[PDB]
């Protein structure tokens, strides 16, 4: 019962036969803003089925020597479909999310992944290697887009914090022995009721192989990883021209 | 007072007639729901300064 699952939202569907339940982040579901919390006067727009549906970004290959990857939200979807058009036409933004990560292998492969969500994941630099140079990461590293970015020092999470305590954040595991998917549901997390989708990133998604991949020669050596996500309870306000930058 | 100019006179009225009055207002005013309007004869936008 807990192994098979189906997720239906909008005009898209996902079916899986090897699952480990669904994590609801911080024990809260996405919802709309109330009148007490709201501050702006103009009424927002709620396009519903055209923006709350599953999107797939890209496929990444798992090697025996991989470090890890990370993505930024909602920076991935600012160029994809009606959600992207609405996000770059309006000034204010709010929504939840549903994240589904897929990776499958055989019964003779082994490995393990940690999939976690960290709000306000600020990226630091190596400070020139000696701590003397006060540099800042380029725009490519801070907001990599829908292609993601690969970690350089996964032990410190590229920010000076240990990875062994990342389980305090909403997370799941993908153990090739047990399951082949991970599902996490995230509400809207911010200190403001609305915010800009082009200047602020709410959180980040981390996929780090804790236990390395292994297999015997003769089996399939290509083990892809695919990311699928869907906004939930999206709201927009502050209509103006369309700005991309 | 006999002549009917003194009886009807308004001289001596010391009370101030006030057009306005003060109301409680501890917080800012709320905003209510409004929809579209397509009508003739109602022009809130047009003013006369």
Residue with tokens 């892809």, as numbered in its chain: A224
Q: What is the DSSP letter of A152?
A: S
Q: Report the DSSP beta bridge partners of residue A184.
A: A23, A99
Q: How many domains would you assign to chain A?
A: 1
Write the CB contacts of A230 (distance below 8 Å, at least 6 apart in sequence).
A9, A10, A12, A52, A53, A54, A55, A97, A98
- The CA-based angle A3-A96-A189, given to 5 degrees, is 115
The CATH number linked to A152 is 2.60.120.20
Q: Sign (positive/negative) of CA torsion A136, A139, A145, A151?
A: negative
Q: What is the DSSP letter of A26?
A: G
Give me the domain span that covers residue A81: 1-245
> What would the two tokens of residue A224 be?
């892809």
C-beta of residue A238 within 8 angstroms of C-beta of residue A93:
no
C-beta of residue A126 within 8 angstroms of C-beta of residue A134:
no
**Resolution, expressed in angstroms to one decimal:** 3.1
Q: End-to-end distance of chain A based on CA atoms, in angstroms? A: 46
> What would the two tokens of residue A204 be?
């980040």
Question: What is the per-residue burial (b if ≥16 Cβ within 10 Å, else e) of A34-47?
Answer: eeeebeeeeebeee
CA-nearest of A179, A29, A161 to A115 is: A179
> What would the two tokens of residue A19 be?
């699952």
> What would the two tokens of residue A215 be?
């297999």
Experimental method: cryo-EM
Q: Report the DSSP beta bridge partners of residue A223.
A: A62
Q: How many CB atoms lie within 10 A of CB A107?
A: 7
B48/A89 Cα distance (integer angstroms): 36
Q: What is the DSSP letter of A74?
A: T
Query: Which stretches within A28-99 are classed as H helix?
Result: 81-89
Phi, psi of A86 (to 5 degrees): -65, -40
Residue with tokens 């999470």, as numbered in its chain: A157
Q: Which long-range contacts (CB under 8 A, 24 or more apart) does A222-225 make?
A: A222/A61, A223/A61, A223/A62, A223/A103, A223/A105, A223/A109, A223/A111, A224/A59, A224/A60, A224/A61, A224/A62, A224/A103, A225/A59, A225/A60, A225/A61, A225/A62, A225/A101, A225/A102, A225/A103, A225/A113
Q: SS3 sequence, chain B?
A: CCCCCCCCCCCCCCCCCCCCCCCCCCCCCCCCCCCCCCCCCCCCCCCCC
């Amino acid at each position: 019962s807990d192994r098979v699952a189906q997720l239906t939202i909008g005009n898209s569907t996902i079916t899986t036969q090897e699952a480990a339940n669904i994590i609801v982040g911080y024990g809260e579901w996405p919802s709309y803003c109330s009148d007490s919390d709201a501050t702006a006067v103009d009424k927002p727009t709620r396009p519903d089925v055209s923006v709350n549906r599953f999107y797939t970004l890209d496929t990444k290959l798992w090697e025996k020597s991989s470090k890890g990857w990370y993505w930024k939200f909602p920076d991935v979807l600012t160029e994809t479909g009606v959600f992207g058009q609405n996000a770059q036409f309006h000034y204010l933004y709010r929504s939840g999310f549903c994240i589904h990560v897929q990776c499958n292998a055989s019964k003779f492969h082994q490995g393990a992944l940690l999939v976690a969500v960290l709000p306000e994941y600020v990226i630091g630099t190596v400070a020139g290697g000696t701590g003397t140079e006060d540099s800042h990461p380029p725009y490519k590293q801070t907001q990599p887009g829908a292609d993601g970015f690969e970690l350089q020092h996964p032990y410190v999470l590229d920010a000076g914090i240990p990875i062994s305590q990342l389980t305090v954040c909403p997370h799941q595991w993908i153990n090739l022995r047990t399951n082949n998917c991970a599902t996490i549901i995230v509400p809207y997390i911010n200190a403001l009721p609305f915010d800009s989708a082009l200047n602020h990133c709410n959180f980040g998604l981390l996929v780090v192989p804790i236990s390395p991949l292994d297999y015997d020669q003769g089996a399939t050596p290509v083990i892809p990883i695919t990311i699928t996500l869907a906004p939930m309870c999206s709201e927009f306000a502050g209509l103006r021209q369309a700005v991309t930058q | 007072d006999r002549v009917a100019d003194v009886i009807e006179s308004s001289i001596g009225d010391s009370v101030s007639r006030a057009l306005t009055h003060a109301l409680p207002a501890p917080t800012g005013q709320d905003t209510q729901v409004s929809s579209h309007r397509l009508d003739t004869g109602k022009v809130p936008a047009l003013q006369a300064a």
